[PDB]
């Protein structure tokens, strides 16, 4: 025989075939993940646990498909997540459409798939000039105008009756982690879950929430202006890099060994008690000799905290991250500190740090959550950063492009009319990127139990004439302008859509043929 | 599955009757057109009927030529008995191929002293049954201690017949598919 | 294209050859099965045992009845197997020789092959060298058909003592030849001469030993008469020496038809009918059997019992269950006919025979008779012996051999003299031609030369002298004398001369050891592609 | 291809009769006289092994003419001595 | 094309694997090498189309290059790895023509083995290929064509759309040839005493899916993917004359050589011996710290100790990365890369001469990336490549691409003589060499012919692939180049056709001069060779011997 290959090659046409119902089939798995009436999708992962929700990007992160074309569409998601954080769904919604309208052409017109290419870069730059045409600005201080904002995606999820409170909780997040270019980052955004509670009190709290509680039983519960010191060694007697290996000869040396391990904790927590800490927050653990002349002085001892919690506490508190204990000054310890306070859940202990409030370094913030079990608390964490993800494109951008379809149906009004004109070769495959941008809105209208036929008729007709930010209302499935139904989402959600999904298309249209099990 | 199968396999053309009034028309005389064919293949391949009293220049006829029949493979089995009127079991083993031959029509009932057969064959083995089918000898049986010896019945030897290959299992003429007409009346009785 | 790739069916077990090392295997595959027989050729030749799977065993050293009853895989030494019986069929004699001579030119081909020569063209100068050998030895080839036929009768003896002297029958080879020369003296016509082969039976008893056997002229049966209390030995009376032998196809029976009847049997009186019908039957057959004066009777098929005695009140012996194809000889020995019916039977249609009798083999219960005729009469059968039952077969065969030897005698009086005579007298014939048209074929003709020559090397082999001044001394002796009838002397002998060594072969059988031997190679040399499909 | 994964094309006998395992152990002599040949003179390892094959061919024959083979096997000592004997007459002699 | 297998032989005897011989073998080596040859013909020129190749744990590769497709085919057949290796030996020196060198050698065995089996001694066929390949660098010589008379980097430009096709990013070749030509600029340097090189690989590719390929940003300068040590440190260092230092000093809480064992009789010297052997780390890094060392780079780690310390300073700190990209920071910056920290002296130090220069440094964010963008470098300018696109598969693609691209322009900047391409040279080739050996006569003639028909495949290849007429390209292509071969030499219209050939994108013949398909001469140069070698390699093969392994 030969080389490890040649099993069964799918080759000519029957390859893209393949390609292009693979492609279609990863759509049609949440075709009715989309539009504000989107039905939920329970996952079922071979490890034991499981997933609850609609959002496309999560979905297909647990699913698995042993073929290598649908793989470069299930990425794809992982592009809109890791860029803005909202429209997943729409990005692998889109791009089926895109390979199968290509479809005909490449079956039976012949045309060859480069042709196809060079068509959709033009229809690329045009689609980004009309979006660019179709957005107005916005302003970025209305605080009325950035809660309608904000809700836009929350609208298509499950907290859509809790939109009043979770536009509040996103804003005040979203402000608190914006630097004042205006760049904000959600690593330092805690996702701390808690079983159980009203959806109504739960509120974000300036500062961090720990699950530990102290050790000492004698440590103040209630501090008035706690100042915290971060430390990063442990409290107990180190070692050493190196064996120490002391050669003893005498009687009166172990006990002088075993004198000086309490000798120097003795000196490490008395320049401690040079400043006079009230929280002691170590990165490491903690020894039980240390902890008792730390509270003779007035400190508070906590176990080991891992250091991305203490890279959040630095910026509440204003310290710094501090190894070296010898080196401990006054300026560098943490201040302004609002109140201390330990609250009684059957789970764990929970220490609340709030802050004064009252230019330098970004300040973090934990924003609780009080869900009916633990799936919610996942589910609803997922539609923070939906909504957050929202909050960012507004101030890294200020134009604000219509929803509802109606950006995309722009496309596919402007790029029909100019297809008449663009006389050639590339005039079937220009045409063909219409027929994809007019089903974004066909399967929001399919999910409303509309008409797909009349209402799409409706449309074009009023597009023209009536106004640009024209699109169908979801709930009740009737046409209904977007300035009056008062429903905005960003532009760069758009411009990601499009360009990820047509740059998608050029990638897995150059596909021949397909080879499978040649090596690891 | 079997159910279905039984009102047409377990039946033949005078049973197949008691279904007219029940089963389908198209149903049943479908089948009726194919068991009436093969009861006329049986009349035309019932070339025989008695015991071929038969001497030795034409056992190299009719014993073998016939194994061949036809030579469509229409082979003939043959049954030979080397008679010898001195022994008990061979006058019992005659009043078998006689019995037979008025059941069994396609397959022929040979017969000839055992004297007569082999030079110097030895008395002490005869009676001896040969069986042959398109030239070869199918079997070679010695005297019949292995079919009961002296008390050899009719049933007995129709069922080496159907191990030889001679008649099928399902025949209705075999005495032991041949139930008695008092047998089928008391089993409709207590149905 | 996909993995599988098939064309005909069973390609794992189907395997090819090609190019100059599949040609190599087959000429070296030839010698496996030379070298076999290369010991058993001459007079000092050794046997070969045969195993069957039956387990029956046999001994010989014909090379026809070696390679036959064998089990083989490669397919060109089939073509050997098909090459001794084609000698032994016809010929009856040289089948080792000719697959010795077979392989040798082989031999010879495979070292001109590798210098450099096309296969078909190395053929065509082996029959232009054959055609050459065969008229060279026709043109210094004696006629024995001038002399009368008390000298032709003593040449029978020196050909009939070659083919016998190769076998173990030559324990006494002046004996057990006059039996291969006397069977034929009876069957000769003295004119036109034909053998008749047909007519000529054999047939050998295991018992005794091999110097009792005799030669008869009459039929040997293996079979008792229909009583025991006859007589064994049977004479003549009076007049009429001829024992008028009546011959019977169908037996002492009823008389009834082929075809399935019944006959209808009514009361008493037809009852008490038919018991007198059978009983003035059997009366009617005495009265008919003496009336032709028959004095002994046999049927191919068993009388009845009531009839076994009826033959032996009026001194009428009878034999019984008389073979068909046995039936037939018998008639033609006597001089007479087989009637089809009983009431045909008359005088004109008996036989005619000195004596028999019922000849006994120590403790065994056996009959055997044993016909004899005082003149001479058409057929002839062997009567042969021995203390196994394998040598009497290898005497049989022996025999046979000798019988097909003599033979081409008759049909054809032009002889030759073997024992390497003949072939060095052609080898040397086509070498004087080689150096006259050199060409290219020259080394075929060289080729064929050294051919031959391995025959009388063989024979030398096995007699233990040297080759070299064997060889050496038949080629320079040879191109000196025109006399050609030197050859190799096996048993020892003082003189090479063969006039007075009483050897003398055919030219009908040396002749075929050369035709098959050629016209096989051109075929084994013709093969390229060697397929075989795996049992 | 030899059996581990290295693969190496040759046409020196030597090496090609090195890598190639063969069963027989006088035909793996060959093996060694090219090595031989290979060690003292460097030149022609293939002719050496072509004329033993064309030697063993002509001795074939010898064996079945009926001569000893210790006579055969001498017979090459003083032909092949006889033979240097030629080499050296028709030996051109060149400067350096 | 080989059916019932060869017969096991009992005459010849030899371990392992069955002995084959006759033309089976060149028979079964050339079904090797369609096997092969099929699967890069389909990939070749911008209408071809590549396949996906699958890497048995969910992972696959969609693959243009020649050298990567048939590195992942591991090819059991002892012919195959010749041009496998041929492939990867190709790429690594010059980087462009690796679908065609295996191309070329596939059509060469087909003919070859046609040649043998026509009964002329393959001797006589390698002898008649080096005569005609000797004949042809002398022609390759003939129809150089220098640059001039050309506005700016035009000649730059339009050779990279040739590398930049057959890919998926040769429609934006338009943005990507003007930043590819940019960066070799960028990294110009000196060696040698006055001949022009650049480094291998010297240009960067971070992979960040995002946006699109058209707004990929060419940012001027160098560019490092690592993480940020503390996140407490500042990500924007304001001001100009930024100073960089590039270290390979390891720096965390160090440990004594292998063979020191201490052993101590006192018990109070543990107090000096832990912070003397954590305070001996702290005598490199306090002297580093005064000389105001803004930003510095390290190859080996460094630990909490030392991190600290830095922050205490607002110094940005970097964790592990390669050794390969700190030596050109600091050609760029114009620092010196230090394995050990030492003086020729009898005490330690640190000077201010190790100290690169830049103008800005910033911590960007490629959406879940952090990279440190360094630019405006004093010493030596440099360049990084920011690769955009859909999903990581495409990046990959982009990877190798740019890498082909960047090596094409590397090599026309070594070289100012250029050939073009699109077939034309193949085409002359063919025509020319069949009018050569006509002289000769005897034996050679029908060689050469078979070899001149030999390159015709490639303008076959690219015909098909586009799925159009390819025998009215070939009328129009060989007979055009003939009536310019045979022409007066004054006569210019003819000449020009010289110049020109076929095009796959409208189907018909146009210039090359303007339509700006262009290739290296150096590309051409020794890529017959490395297959006149590979064809020699299997065709002078009789018999094949294989031994089982053990
Ligand atoms: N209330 C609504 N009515 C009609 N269309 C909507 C509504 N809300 C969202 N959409 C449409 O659904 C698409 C996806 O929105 P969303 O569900 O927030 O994102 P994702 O698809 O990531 O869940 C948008 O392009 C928008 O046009
Ligand atoms: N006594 C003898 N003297 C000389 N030559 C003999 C003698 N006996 C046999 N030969 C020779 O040996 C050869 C042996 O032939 P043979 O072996 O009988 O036939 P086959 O080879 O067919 O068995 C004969 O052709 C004959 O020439
Ligand atoms: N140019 C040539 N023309 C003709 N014959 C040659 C030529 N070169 C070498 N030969 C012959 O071919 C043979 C080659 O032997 P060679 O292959 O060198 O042996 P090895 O490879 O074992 O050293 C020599 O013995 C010589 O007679
Ligand atoms: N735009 C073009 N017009 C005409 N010919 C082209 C064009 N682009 C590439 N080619 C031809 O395609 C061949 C192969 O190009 P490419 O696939 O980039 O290199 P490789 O063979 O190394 O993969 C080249 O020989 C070149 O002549
Ligand atoms: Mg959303
Ligand atoms: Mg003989
Ligand atoms: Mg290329």
């Known amino acids: ?224 202006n706690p100042r915290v010191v971060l430390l990063d060694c442990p409290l107990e007697y180190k070692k050493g890099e190196s064996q120490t290996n002391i050669e003893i000869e005498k009687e009166e040396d172990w006990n002088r060994i075993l004198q000086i391990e309490e000798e120097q904790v003795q000196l490490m927590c008395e320049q401690i008690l040079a400043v006079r800490p009230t929280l002691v927050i170590t990165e490491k653990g903690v020894s039980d000799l240390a902890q008792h002349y730390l509270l003779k002085g007035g400190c508070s001892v906590l176990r080991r905290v891992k250091k991305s919690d203490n890279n959040r506490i630095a910026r509440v508190t204003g310290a710094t991250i501090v190894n070296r204990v010898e080196d401990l000054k006054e300026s560098d310890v943490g ?186 | 599955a079997k159910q279905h199968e039984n009102r047409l396999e377990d039946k033949d053309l005078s049973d197949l009757e008691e279904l007219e009034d029940d089963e389908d028309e198209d149903f049943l005389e479908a089948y009726k057109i194919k068991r009436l064919n093969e009861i006329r293949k049986l009349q035309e391949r019932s070339k025989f009927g008695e015991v071929f009293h038969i001497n030795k220049p034409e056992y190299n006829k009719e014993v073998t030529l016939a194994s061949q029949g036809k030579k469509d493979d229409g082979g003939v089995y043959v049954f030979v008995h080397l008679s010898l009127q001195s022994k008990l079991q061979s006058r019992i083993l005659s009043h078998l191929f006689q019995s037979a031959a008025c059941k069994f029509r396609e397959i022929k009932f040979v017969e000839i002293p055992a004297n007569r057969a082999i030079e110097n064959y030895p008395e002490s083995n005869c009676p001896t049954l040969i069986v042959y089918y398109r030239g070869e000898v199918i079997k070679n049986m010695i005297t019949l201690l292995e079919l009961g010896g002296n008390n050899s019945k009719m049933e007995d030897f129709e069922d080496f017949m159907v191990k030889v290959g001679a008649v099928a299992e399902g025949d209705n003429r075999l005495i032991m598919n041949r139930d008695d007409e008092e047998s089928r009346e008391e089993r409709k009785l207590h149905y | ?206 018992g005794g030993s091999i110097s009792d056997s005799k030669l008869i002229n009459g039929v040997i049966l293996d079979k008792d008469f229909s009583h025991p209390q006859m007589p064994k030995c049977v004479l003549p009376k009076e007049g009429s020496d001829g024992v008028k032998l009546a011959i019977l196809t169908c037996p002492f029976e009823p008389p009834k038809p082929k075809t399935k009847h019944k006959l209808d049997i009514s009361s008493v009186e037809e009852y008490q009918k038919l018991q007198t019908y059978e009983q003035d039957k059997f009366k009617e057959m005495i009265d008919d059997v003496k ?85 001479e009469t058409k057929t002839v059968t062997c009567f042969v012996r021995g203390s196994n039952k394998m040598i009497v077969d290898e005497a049989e065969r022996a025999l046979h051999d000798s019988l097909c030897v003599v033979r081409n005698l008759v049909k054809d009086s032009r002889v030759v003299y073997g024992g390497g005579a003949a072939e060095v007298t052609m080898s040397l014939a086509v070498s004087e031609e080689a150096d006259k048209q050199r060409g290219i074929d020259q080394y075929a003709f060289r080729g064929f030369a050294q051919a031959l020559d391995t025959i009388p090397m063989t024979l030398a082999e096995n007699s233990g002298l040297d080759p070299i001044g064997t060889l050496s001394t038949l080629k320079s002796k040879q191109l000196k004398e025109k006399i050609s009838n030197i050859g190799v002397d096996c048993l020892g002998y003082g003189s090479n001369d063969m006039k007075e060594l009483f050897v003398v072969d055919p030219f009908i059988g040396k002749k075929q050891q050369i035709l098959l031997a050629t016209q096989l190679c051109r075929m084994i040399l013709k093969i390229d592609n060697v397929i075989i499909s795996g049992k | 291809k030899t059996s581990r994964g290295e693969i190496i094309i040759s046409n020196d006998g030597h090496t090609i009769l090195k890598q190639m395992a063969i069963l027989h152990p006088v035909a793996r002599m060959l093996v060694e006289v090219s090595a031989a040949q290979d060690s003292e003179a460097g030149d022609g390892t293939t002719s050496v092994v072509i004329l033993t094959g064309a030697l063993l061919g002509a001795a074939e024959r010898l064996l079945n003419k009926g001569i000893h083979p210790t006579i055969i096997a001498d017979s090459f000592q003083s032909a092949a001595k006889r033979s240097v004997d030629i080499l050296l007459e028709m030996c051109h002699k060149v400067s350096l | 094309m080989s059916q019932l297998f060869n017969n096991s032989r009992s005459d010849t005897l030899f371990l392992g694997g069955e002995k084959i011989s006759g033309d089976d073998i060149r028979n079964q080596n050339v079904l090797a090498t369609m096997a092969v040859a099929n699967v890069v013909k389909s990939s070749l020129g911008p209408v071809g189309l590549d396949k996906m190749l699958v890497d048995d744990i969910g992972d696959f590769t969609v693959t243009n290059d020649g050298a990567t497709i048939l590195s992942l085919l591991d090819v059991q057949h002892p012919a195959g790895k010749i041009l496998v290796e041929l492939a990867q030996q190709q790429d690594r020196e010059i980087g462009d023509g690796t679908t065609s060198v295996v191309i070329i050698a596939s059509e060469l065995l087909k003919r070859a083995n046609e040649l043998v089996k026509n009964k002329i001694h393959p001797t006589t066929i390698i002898t008649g290929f080096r005569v005609a390949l000797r004949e042809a660098i002398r022609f390759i010589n003939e129809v150089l064509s220098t640059s001039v008379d050309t506005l700016g980097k035009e000649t730059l430009i339009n050779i990279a759309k040739t590398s930049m096709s057959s890919k998926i990013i040769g429609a934006d070749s338009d943005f990507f040839s003007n930043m590819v030509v940019d960066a070799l600029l960028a990294v110009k340097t000196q060696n040698s005493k006055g001949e022009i090189k650049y480094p291998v690989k010297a240009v960067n590719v971070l992979k960040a899916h995002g946006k699109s390929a058209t707004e990929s940003l060419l940012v001027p300068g160098y560019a490092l993917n690592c993480t940020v040590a503390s996140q407490a440190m500042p990500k924007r260092i304001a001001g100009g004359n930024v100073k960089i230092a590039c270290l390979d000093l390891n720096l965390q809480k160090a440990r004594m050589a292998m063979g020191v064992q201490i052993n101590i009789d006192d018990p109070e010297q543990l107090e000096q011996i832990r912070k003397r052997e954590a305070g001996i780390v702290l005598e490199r890094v306090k002297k580093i710290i005064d000389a105001g060392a803004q930003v510095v780079l390290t190859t080996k780690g460094i630990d909490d100790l030392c991190l600290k310390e830095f922050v205490e300073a607002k110094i940005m700190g970097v964790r592990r990365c390669k050794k390969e990209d700190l030596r050109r920071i600091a050609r760029a910056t114009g620092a010196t890369l230090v394995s050990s920290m030492s003086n020729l002296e009898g005490e330690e130090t640190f000077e201010s001469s190790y100290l690169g220069l830049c103008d800005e440094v910033v911590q960007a964010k490629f959406s879940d990336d952090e990279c440190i963008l360094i630019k405006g470098t004093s010493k030596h300018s440099s ?77 076959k290849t690219l015909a098909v692939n586009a799925a159009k007429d390819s025998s009215e390209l070939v009328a129009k292509l060989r007979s055009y180049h003939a009536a310019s071969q045979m022409a007066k030499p004054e006569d210019v219209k003819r000449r020009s056709y010289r110049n020109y050939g076929l095009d796959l994108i409208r189907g018909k013949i146009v210039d090359e001069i303007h339509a700006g398909v262009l290739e290296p001469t150096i590309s051409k140069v020794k890529s017959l060779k490395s297959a006149l070698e590979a064809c020699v390699a299997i065709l002078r093969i009789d018999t094949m011997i294989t031994v089982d392994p053990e």
């Not at chain 1, 980052?185 to 961090?208: A, F, N, Q, T």
């Not at chain 3, 039977?345 to 005729?373: A, N, P, V, W």
Request: proline share 3%.
């Open chain 3, 291 to 375: 009336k032709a004066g028959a004095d002994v009777v046999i049927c191919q098929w068993g009388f009845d019992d009531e009839a076994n005695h009826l033959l032996l009140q009026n001194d009428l012996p009878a034999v019984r269950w008389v073979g068909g194809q046995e039936l037939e000889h018998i008639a033609i020995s006597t001089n007479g006919r087989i009637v089809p019916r009983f009431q045909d039977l008359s005088k004109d249609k008996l036989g005619t025979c000195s004596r028999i009798y019922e000849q006994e083999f120590g403790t065994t219960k056996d009959r055997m008779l044993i016909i004899e005729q005082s003149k």
């Open chain 1, 1 to 224: 025989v030969f080389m490890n290959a040649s099993q069964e090659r799918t080759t000519g046409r029957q390859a893209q075939i393949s390609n292009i119902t693979a492609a279609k089939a990863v759509a049609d798995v949440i075709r009715t993940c989309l539009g504000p009436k989107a039905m939920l999708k329970m996952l079922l992962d071979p490890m034991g646990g499981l997933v609850l929700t609609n959002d496309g990007h999560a979905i297909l992160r647990e699913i698995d498909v042993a073929h290598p074309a649908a793989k470069s569409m299930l990425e794809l998601s992982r592009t809109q997540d890791e860029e803005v954080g909202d429209g997943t769904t729409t990005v692998i919604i889109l791009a089926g459409e895109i390979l199968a309208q290509c479809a005909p052409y490449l079956i039976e017109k012949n045309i060859h798939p480069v042709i196809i290419i060079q068509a959709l870069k033009k229809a690329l730059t045009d689609a980004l000039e009309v979006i660019k045409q179709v957005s107005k600005p916005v302003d970025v201080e209305n605080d009325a105008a950035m809660k309608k904002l904000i809700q836009a995606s929350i609208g298509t999820k499950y907290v859509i009756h809790w939109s009043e409170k979770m536009c509040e909780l996103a804003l005040d997040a979203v402000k608190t982690v914006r630097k004042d270019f205006e760049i904000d980052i959600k690593r330092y955004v805690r996702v701390e879950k808690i079983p159980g509670g009203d959806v109504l009190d739960s509120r974000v709290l300036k500062g961090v929430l720990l699950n530990k509680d102290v050790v000492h039983p004698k440590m103040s519960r209630h501090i008035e």
């Open chain 1, 335 to 520: 201040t302004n500190c609002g109140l201390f306070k330990v609250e009684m859940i059957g789970d764990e202990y929970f220490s609340f740090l709030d802050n004064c409030k009252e230019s330098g370094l970004q300040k973090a913030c934990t924003i609780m959550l009080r869900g009916g079990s633990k799936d919610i608390l996942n589910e609803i964490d997922r539609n923070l950063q939906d909504a957050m993800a929202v909050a960012r494109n507004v101030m890294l951008s200020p134009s604000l492009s219509p929803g509802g379809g109606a950006t995309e149906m722009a496309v596919s009004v402007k790029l029909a009319e100019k297809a008449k004109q663009l006389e050639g070769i590339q005039q079937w495959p220009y045409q063909a990127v219409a027929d994809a941008m007019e089903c974004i809105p066909r399967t929001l209208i399919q999910n409303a139990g509309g008409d797909p036929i009349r209402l799409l008729s409706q449309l074009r007709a009023k597009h023209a004439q009536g106004n640009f930010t024209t699109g169908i209302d979801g709930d009740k499935g009737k046409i209904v302008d977007m300035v009056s139904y008062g429903i905005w989402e960003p532009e760069v959600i758009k411009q990601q859509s499009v360009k990820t999904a047509i740059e998608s298309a050029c990638l897995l249209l150059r596909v021949d043929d397909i080879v499978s099990g040649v090596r690891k």
């Open chain 5, 383 to 459: 360049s990084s490549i920011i690769l955009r696109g859909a999903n990581d598969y495409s990046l990959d693609e982009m990877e190798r691409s740019l890498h082909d691209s960047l090596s094409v322009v590397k090599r026309t900047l070594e070289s100012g003589n250029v050939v073009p391409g699109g077939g034309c040279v193949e085409a002359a080739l063919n025509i020319y060499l069949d009018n050569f050996a006509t002289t000769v006569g005897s034996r050679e003639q029908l060689a050469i012919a078979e070899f001149a028909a030999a390159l015709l495949i490639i303008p």
């Open chain 3, 1 to 206: 294209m996909g993995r599988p790739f098939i064309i005909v069916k069973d390609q794992g077990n189907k395997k090819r050859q090609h190019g100059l090392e599949a040609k190599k295997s087959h000429i070296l595959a030839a010698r496996s099965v030379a070298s076999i027989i290369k010991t058993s050729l001459g007079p000092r030749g050794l046997d070969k045992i045969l195993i069957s799977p039956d387990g029956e065993i046999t001994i010989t050293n014909d090379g026809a009845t070696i390679l036959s009853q064998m089990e083989l895989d490669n397919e060109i030494a089939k073509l050997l197997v098909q090459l001794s019986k084609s000698q032994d069929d016809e010929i009856g004699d040289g089948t080792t020789g000719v697959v010795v001579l077979a392989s040798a030119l082989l031999d010879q081909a495979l070292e001109l092959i590798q210098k450099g020569i096309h296969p078909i063209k190395i053929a065509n100068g082996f029959d232009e060298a054959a055609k050459l050998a065969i008229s060279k030895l026709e043109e210094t080839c004696d006629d024995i058909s001038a002399s009368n036929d008390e000298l032709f009768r003593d040449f029978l003896l020196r050909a009939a003592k070659t083919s016998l002297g190769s076998k173990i029958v030559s324990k006494d080879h002046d004996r057990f030849a006059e039996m291969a020369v006397e069977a034929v003296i009876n069957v000769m016509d003295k004119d036109r001469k034909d053998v008749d082969f047909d007519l000529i039976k054999m047939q050998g008893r295991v």
